[PDB]
Amino acid sequence: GMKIAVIGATGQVGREIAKLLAEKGHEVTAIASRSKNPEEVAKLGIEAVYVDGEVLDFKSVEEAVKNADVVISVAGG
Amino acid sequence: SGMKIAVIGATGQVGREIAKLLAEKGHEVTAIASRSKNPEEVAKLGIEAVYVDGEVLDFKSVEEAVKNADVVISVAGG
Numbered sequence: 001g002m003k004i005a006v007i008g009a010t011g012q013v014g015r016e017i018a019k020l021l022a023e024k025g026h027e028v029t030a031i032a033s034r035s036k037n038p039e040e041v042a043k044l045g046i047e048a049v050y051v052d053g054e055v056l057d058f059k060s061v062e063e064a065v066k067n068a069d070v071v072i073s074v075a076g077g
Numbered sequence: 078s079g080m081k082i083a084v085i086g087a088t089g090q091v092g093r094e095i096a097k098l099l100a101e102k103g104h105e106v107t108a109i110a111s112r113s114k115n116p117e118e119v120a121k122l123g124i125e126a127v128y129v130d131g132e133v134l135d136f137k138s139v140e141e142a143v144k145n146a147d148v149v150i151s152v153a154g155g
Contacts, residue, residue, distance in 0.1 A: 004091070005146035008120035010128065011155040013082065013099065020098045021091065021150075029142040032128040035120040035153040038083070045114030049088060064107045068083035069154055072099075075116035076148040077089035 001025035008035035013070055038068045079105045086112035091148055119151035 003026070006018045010032040018030045036044070042065040050056050065071055084096050087108040096108035113119060120126070122143060124136050143149055 002147040003145055004148045004150065005143045006150045006152065007122070007143060008152040009155040011152075012102075013080075013104075013155060014152040016098060016102060017095055017150060017152070020094060024094065026148075029146070031122075031139055031142065033120050033122060034126040034128070035151065036118070038154050041085075041113065041119055041153045044118050046085070046111050047114050049110035049112060051110050061109060061111050064083045064109060065085060067081065068107070069080045070082045070104075071119070071153040072082060072084040072095055073113045073116055073119045073151040073153065074084065074086035074089065074092045074095070074148065075113065075151070076146070077091065 001027060003027045004029070006030045008033055009070070013072070017072070038071045039066050041071045041073065042066045079103050082106050084108045086110075086116070088112070089148075091150075095150070116149065116151065119153050 018028050022028045082104045088110045100106045
């Protein structure tokens with residue numbers, strides 16, 4: 001298992017994520033805090049990543065983040 | 078019409094698990110390999126930004142739990 005911090009919006013989504021990853025054997029710390037909104041997150045900048053067999057559609061990526069109700073941004077692995 | 082959730086940086090096992098979980102919870106999920114260029118700014122930790130009382134669990138303990146993490150999941154919106 002790994003060390004995982006789950007930060008930002010308090011709510012069912014963040015709690016369920018945290019719960020799942022603890023169930024998978026990770027060491028999970030949850031910190032409630034203020035976050036940017038989806039449009040602000042998009043405007044932080046996105047690094048486009050190609051997936052074999054899929055069109056990498058720049059506008060589709062922009063729209064998916066900007067128009068989300070919730071954005072989960074995963075960093076590290 | 079369930080909540081629209083974008084998972085960005087979903088290239089790893091943890092991203093895939095999150096995407097799977099949230100679709101099981103009836104959300105409309107778009108998992109995206111493309112990732113934030115500035116991940117730490119999604120939920121930037123500062124004394125003013127953290128909802129946890131700094132008299133109880135201090136800012137340094139908060140900062141350390143994120144610094145020592147292998148993976149940081151930042152949840153934006155709700």
